[PDB]
Amino acid sequence: QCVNFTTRTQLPPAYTNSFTRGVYYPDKVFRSSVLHSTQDLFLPFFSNVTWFHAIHKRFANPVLPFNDGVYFASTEKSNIIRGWIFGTTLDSKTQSLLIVNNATNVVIKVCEFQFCNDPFLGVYYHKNNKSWMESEFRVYSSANNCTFEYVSQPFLMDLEGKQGNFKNLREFVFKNIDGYFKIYSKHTPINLVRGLPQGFSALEPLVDLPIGINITRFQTLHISSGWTAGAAAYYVGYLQPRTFLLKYNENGTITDAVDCALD
Amino acid sequence: AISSVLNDILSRLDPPEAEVQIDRLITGRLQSLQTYVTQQLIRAAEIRA
Amino acid sequence: AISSVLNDILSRLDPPEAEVQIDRLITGRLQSLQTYVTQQLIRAAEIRASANLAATKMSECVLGQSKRVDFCGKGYHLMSFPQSAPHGVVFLHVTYV
Amino acid sequence: SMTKTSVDCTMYICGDSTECSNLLLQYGSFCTQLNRALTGIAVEQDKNTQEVFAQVKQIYKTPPIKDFGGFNFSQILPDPSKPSKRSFIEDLLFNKVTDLICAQKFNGLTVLPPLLTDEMIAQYT
Amino acid sequence: PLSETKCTLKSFTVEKGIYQTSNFRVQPTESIVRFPNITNLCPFGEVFNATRFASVYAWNRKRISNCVADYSVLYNSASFSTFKCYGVSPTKLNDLCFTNVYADSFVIRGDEVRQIAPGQTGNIADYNYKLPDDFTGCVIAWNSNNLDSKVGGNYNYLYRLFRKSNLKPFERDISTEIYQAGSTPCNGVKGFNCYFPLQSYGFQPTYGVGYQPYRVVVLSFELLHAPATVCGPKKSTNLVKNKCVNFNFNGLTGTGVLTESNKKFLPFQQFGRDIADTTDAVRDPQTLEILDITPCSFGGVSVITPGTNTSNQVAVLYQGVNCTEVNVFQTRAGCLIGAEHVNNSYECDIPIGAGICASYQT
């Protein structure tokens, strides 16, 4: 908590390309064999996303603005990301939002958090009774004055380390509508060496948070100074008022999307 | 509108209020007259053929 | 207006308040309906000219033998075979070249 | 000819509501003439087929013993063994020309059936 | 039906032929609306007995959802000074269902009463609290000048007159510090043609109505596409399919026949719509079920009768529908009553369509 990571240094702003990502259900309305158009905050196709990774001498825990909207794309074998940190001051001076997955459900709380130097999570020496359950909380020292709490439905999470190309893919989109936080979640296996694979996927709504707090900055949590990290890769995108064409199948899944102003 | 007779509109509502009721008739009558002219031009193309 | 569904408007606003909202929806739909009818009357005249030309080609090319050039098709006209087609008719022209 | 269509402004303004019907009375006959205009279109669609497809009032047939002088007319002649009389050429003409219509009928759009069916038109031909 | 053509043609002599007169439609016999059980009732009357309310920007909220709404204790009838309501009264909220309800209480001024309205601007509307477009309730107000008013103004309560930007619906600012007021940031401490954002009530009991306090209680309403958990005082009016009914499903009010289909739906998508952006298929919010929306049958009326000098016999024709109510015959055109079907073929006289012709014979 107090002592930061020993081998951590400053990460350079590396960029890469994201092809079809940014597509999501704009509303909860079902659709059957019908095409529609909509305008909302989107991630443009063939855009540039910032390359983020954690390797044993670059440990990524930056601070980026939430003002214009933020896109999450995480390509990881061990699903090393346990969640994210939200807030403005990101300290006990005001309230800040935290989303942490304990590998069973997702705990969402709004409290007064005491922010140390280097937050992080995870477990040590997994070889004995793994269970991948949150035990040591290294992110904040304490909390109080909690005005919001939420518990989601049970989830399945495999954090075990693997070798070779990337497998699990989790893409989240976090936005603010009139104070309501609308969360998108999708999980599908992929095969990735570097960059991003060529394909298409649809994002589904998860939970709507009626909090109403302003978030000007955010952080990322991985996995006390002697701990190392596995193979992790993820992105932070920026949403824009793009216009897409959303095609729907008979079951309501979007297999096709077209960005108007790209081509 | 309130009534088709304009003499009843001018003799009751105020000049600023009367223009609103009269405007509803003018836009309705000009559209009805435009519909008549539209039908005449279509029938005029049939009689010329 | 506020919305395009009267079930939401009539169940909320007052009769004097909803009267202005429904008046704009009806007037817009009456103008939208006249737009379709006007476009159909124009196509009704275009399809009539194609029908009058069809009865002319059916009589001269099929029933009889027409000497008109570029009417029954290229070449010296011999006969013509009509064929049924959806919303129309197909003419098989036999000519001498 | 084209597809016969019929539209009613009674259901077009809104259904099962006295609010639309009361205000249409103030507008009077505005869309009543529109209902007569589209009705006259459907009448013109059926008259276009009468002045063209049927030239004469008498029906003619092919002989059972066919000597055509060397030409083969079996392509243009319909098949008597089929339930619907169609030739080899009319089979392609029908198949190469292409629910959308059922969904539009829910808003008050009425598609009138034609005066003559596919079996009728082939019999005049 | 013979005289129906007389008024259609505006003549007392009806010539032979087919004429359109009226349009038949099947009216719904019952109303099928299905939503699950009630959770709790909102504290509509419990907030009226509070000693002191919060300010405009400080509004306190008690969260009780599932808009059944307490209908028992109602102080809203002729008990207060001024009644300004929108939508429907809270007595009628028993027929409607809302997702979440936030009960708010605040004190405003005389000139700030007109600024209260859903989806509207204003000094306190944009900069402090804005009503959502989902609020169908009444705005309750009463004159507190005999209590909260003090000599020389009451500075206990506060309000924020200025803010750097307008607030979105459902947004709060509790900051009492000095921030940007106008469009030009003055960088903290007041000056450089900026203004101190926080303000205090100047309520004087001896001045006019604009300078006097008014206690206002508004219960925030939320209407979204999420499934509703409550229906009325009574719920189901148990479903009987294959009948014309008036349905309200997941907030979609319509009239049509309810049938079961094979359509496969996603768990997170409640209701579908066709290419016309109209209700197509919906799901049961109470239990697990899939219903298809089939609108009730309708069509035009066709009258087939000979001339006035021939006979008075009239044959009514229904276009493109099957007659289950009702010489009742059915053809490709539809239900035809008042006529006899003849297998023999005759010259076409009265046009019918779909390969059918009618005539007056023996």
Q: Does C51 touch chain B (CB under 8 A)?
A: no
| Structure-token pair, residue E271 | 């209701």
Q: Does B35 touch chain C (CB under 8 A)?
A: yes
Q: Output phi, psi for B32, to 5 deg.
A: -70, -40
Q: Does E298 touch chain A (CB under 8 A)?
A: no
| C-alpha span between D75 and E340 (Å, rounded) | 41
Beta bridge partners of E220: E102
Q: Does B46 touch chain C (CB under 8 A)?
A: yes
Instruction: Write out E103-154 in H/E/C secondary structure.
Output: EEEEEECCCCCCCCCECCCCHHHHHCCCECCCCCCEEEEEECCCCCCCCCCC
CA distances from E107 to D30, E101, E203, E204, E262 (A): 52, 20, 11, 14, 55
Q: Which residue of C has its CA nearest to B40?
A: C41
Question: A touches B (3+ CB pairs < 8 Å)?
Answer: no
Q: Which residue of D has its CA nearest to B25?
A: D27
CB A91 within 8 A of CB A119: no
Question: A touches E (3+ CB pairs < 8 Å)?
Answer: yes
| C-alpha span between A71 and E319 (Å, rounded) | 55
> Cα(first)–Cα(last) distance of chain E, in Å?
22
| C-alpha span between E248 and E227 (Å, rounded) | 11
| Residue where the block lists tokens 């124009």 | C42
Instruction: For an interface test with D, give the residue of C47, C78, C84 to mutate (most D CBs within 10 A).
Output: C84
Considering only the beta carbons, identify the residue of B38, B45, B46 that sits closest to C38.
Answer: B38
Strands (E), chain E: 17-25, 30-33, 60-63, 82-85, 101-108, 138-143, 158-160, 198-200, 214-221, 244-249, 252-259, 271-273, 279-283, 290-294, 298-305, 315-318, 328-330, 335-337, 350-351, 357-358
Chain C interface residues (partner D, CB cutoff 8 A):
6, 10, 18, 22-23, 26, 29-30, 33-34, 36-37, 40-41, 43-44, 47-48, 51-52, 54-55, 58-59, 62-63, 81-90, 92
Residue C26: its chain B contacts at CB < 8 A? none
Which chains sit next to A, with 3 or more Cβ pairs under 8 A?
E
Q: Is A143 exposed, middle or buried (0-12, 13-18, 19+ CB in 10 A)?
A: middle
Instruction: For an interface test with C, give the residue of B2, B26, B30, B38 to mutate (most C CBs within 10 A).
Output: B38
Considering only the beta carbons, identify the residue of C26, C44, C85 that sits closest to D23.
Answer: C26
Instruction: For an interface test with D, give the residue of E19, E20, E348, E352 to mutate (most D CBs within 10 A).
Output: E20
Say if strands E271-273 and A30-31 run parallel, antiparallel, or are unpaired. parallel
Considering only the beta carbons, identify the residue of E27, E275, E351 that sits closest to D115.
Answer: E351
- From E180, E94, E183, select the one nearest E137 (Cα to Cα): E94
Q: Looking at residue A154, what DSSP letter applies?
A: -
| Structure-token pair, residue E187 | 């960088």
Largest alpha-carbon pair distance within chain B? 52
Q: Output phi, psi for E81, to 5 deg.
A: -75, -50
**DSSP per residue, E160-186:** E---SSPPPSS------S----SSS--
- From B46, E86, D100, select the one nearest C52 (Cα to Cα): B46
| C-alpha span between A246 and A29 (Å, rounded) | 13
**Contact partners, residue D58, CB within 8 Å, separation at least 6:** none
CB A143 within 8 A of CB A114: yes
| Structure-token pair, residue D20 | 């639309």
Residue B49: its chain C contacts at CB < 8 A? 48-49, 52
- From C81, C49, C67, select the one nearest D51 (Cα to Cα): C49
**Contact partners, residue E92, CB within 8 Å, separation at least 6:** none
Check D39 against E20: CB less than 8 A apart.
Answer: yes
**DSSP per residue, E2-13:** HHHHHHHHTSS-
Q: Does C12 touch chain E (CB under 8 A)?
A: yes
CA atoms within 13 A on the CB side of C63: 12
Instruction: For an interface test with E, give the residue of C12, C17, C21 to mutate (most E CBs within 10 A).
Output: C12
**DSSP per residue, A13-34:** -EEEEESSTT-B-SSS-EESS-
Q: Looking at residue A84, what DSSP letter applies?
A: E
Q: Does C41 touch chain B (CB under 8 A)?
A: yes
Tell me, what amino acid is at C9?
I
| Structure-token pair, residue E354 | 């779909």
Beta bridge partners of E141: E82, E216
| Structure-token pair, residue E40 | 């709790």
Strands (E), C1-97: 76-85, 88-96
| Structure-token pair, residue D45 | 């669609």
| C-alpha span between D116 and E6 (Å, rounded) | 29
| Helix ranges restricted to H, D1-125 | 9-13, 18-27, 32-53, 88-95, 100-104, 118-124
Q: Which H or E run includes A65? A: strand A64-65
**In the CATH hierarchy, which top-level class contains the domain A15-263?**
mainly beta
Q: Which residue of D has its CA nearest to C20?
A: D23
CA B35, B41, B43, B46 torsion-angle sign: negative
Q: Does C49 touch chain B (CB under 8 A)?
A: yes
| Structure-token pair, residue E38 | 């009630």
Q: Does B27 touch chain C (CB under 8 A)?
A: no
| C-alpha span between E60 and E219 (Å, rounded) | 11
User: How many residue contacts between C and D have a Cβ separation below 8 Å?
Assistant: 101
- The packing angle between helices D18-27 and C15-57, to 10°, is 70
Check A251 against E268: CB less than 8 A apart.
Answer: no
- From E31, E25, E22, select the one nearest E231 (Cα to Cα): E31
Check E253 against C13: CB less than 8 A apart.
Answer: no
Q: Does D33 touch chain B (CB under 8 A)?
A: yes
| Structure-token pair, residue C12 | 């909320």
| Structure-token pair, residue E82 | 């001024």
Q: Does D29 touch chain B (CB under 8 A)?
A: no
| C-alpha span between C29 and E260 (Å, rounded) | 33
CA atoms within 13 A on the CB side of A210: 10
| Residue where the block lists tokens 């009960």 | E103
CB D5 within 8 A of CB D111: yes
Instruction: For an interface test with A, give the residue of E269, E271, E283 to mutate (most A CBs within 10 A).
Output: E269
| Helix ranges restricted to H, B1-49 | 6-10, 15-48
| C-alpha span between E48 and E69 (Å, rounded) | 15
| Structure-token pair, residue D88 | 């080899």
CB D103 within 8 A of CB E295: no
| C-alpha span between C14 and C10 (Å, rounded) | 8
| Residue where the block lists tokens 């009818």 | C37
Largest alpha-carbon pair distance within chain C? 79
- From E154, E192, E185, E179, select the one nearest E52 (Cα to Cα): E154
Beta bridge partners of E256: E245
How close, in Å, is residue B33 to chain D by CA atoms? 11
| C-alpha span between A185 and A181 (Å, rounded) | 13
Check C83 against D125: CB less than 8 A apart.
Answer: yes
- The packing angle between helices C15-57 and B15-48, to 10°, is 10
CB C86 within 8 A of CB D97: yes
Say if strands E315-318 and E335-337 run parallel, antiparallel, or are unpaired. antiparallel
- Count each helix (H run) and each strand (E run) in chain D, helices first: 6, 2
Local structure of E361: helix, strand or coil: coil
CB A39 within 8 A of CB A259: no
> What is the residue extent of each domain of chain A?
15-263
| C-alpha span between E275 and E256 (Å, rounded) | 18
Residues in chain C: 97
Q: Which residue of B has its CA nearest to D30?
A: B32
- ∠ CA E250-E256-E260, rounded to 5°: 75
| C-alpha span between A109 and A151 (Å, rounded) | 9
Phi-psi region of A257 (alpha: psi -120 to 50; beta: other; left: phi over 0): beta
| Structure-token pair, residue C11 | 């169940």
How close, in Å, is residue A3 to chain E by CA atoms? 34
- From E101, E192, E112, select the one nearest E159 (Cα to Cα): E112
Considering only the beta carbons, identify the residue of B35, B38, B42 that sits closest to C45.
Answer: B42
| Residue where the block lists tokens 């505005």 | D30
Residues in chain D: 125
- From E100, E32, E35, select the one nearest E69 (Cα to Cα): E100
Q: Does B38 touch chain C (CB under 8 A)?
A: yes
Residue D37: its chain B contacts at CB < 8 A? 39
| C-alpha span between C88 and C51 (Å, rounded) | 9
Which pairs from E109-112 meet CB under 8 Å and 24+ separation? E109/E201, E109/E203, E109/E210, E109/E211, E109/E212, E109/E213, E109/E214, E110/E208, E110/E209, E110/E210, E110/E211, E110/E212, E110/E214, E111/E210, E112/E56, E112/E214
Local structure of A116: helix, strand or coil: coil
Q: Does D30 touch chain B (CB under 8 A)?
A: yes
- From A89, A69, A73, A70, select the one nearest A81 (Cα to Cα): A73
| Residue where the block lists tokens 């299905």 | E34
- From E277, E227, E226, select the one nearest E34 (Cα to Cα): E227
Q: Does D34 touch chain E (CB under 8 A)?
A: no
Q: Which H or E run includes C25? A: helix C15-57
Phi-psi region of E119 (alpha: psi -120 to 50; beta: other; left: phi over 0): left
| Helix ranges restricted to H, chain E | 2-9, 123-127
**Contact partners, residue D105, CB within 8 Å, separation at least 6:** D111
CA distances from A151 to A155, A221, E9, E179, E248 (A): 11, 19, 70, 36, 31
| C-alpha span between A148 and A209 (Å, rounded) | 9
Check C58 against D94: CB less than 8 A apart.
Answer: no
Check D20 against C6: CB less than 8 A apart.
Answer: yes
Which strands form E244-249's sheet, in the order they lie side by side? A30-31, E271-273, E279-283, E290-294, E252-259, E244-249, E30-33
| C-alpha span between A74 and A192 (Å, rounded) | 11
Tell me, what amino acid is at B40?
Q
Q: Which residue of E has its CA nearest to D116?
A: E355
Q: Output phi, psi for D90, to 5 deg.
A: -70, -20
**In chain D, which among 56-75 make CB contacts under 8 A with chain C?**
none
How close, in Å, is residue C67 to chain D by CA atoms? 20
Instruction: For an interface test with D, give the residue of E23, E273, E278 to mutate (most D CBs within 10 A).
Output: E23
| C-alpha span between E316 and C55 (Å, rounded) | 35
CB D75 within 8 A of CB C67: no
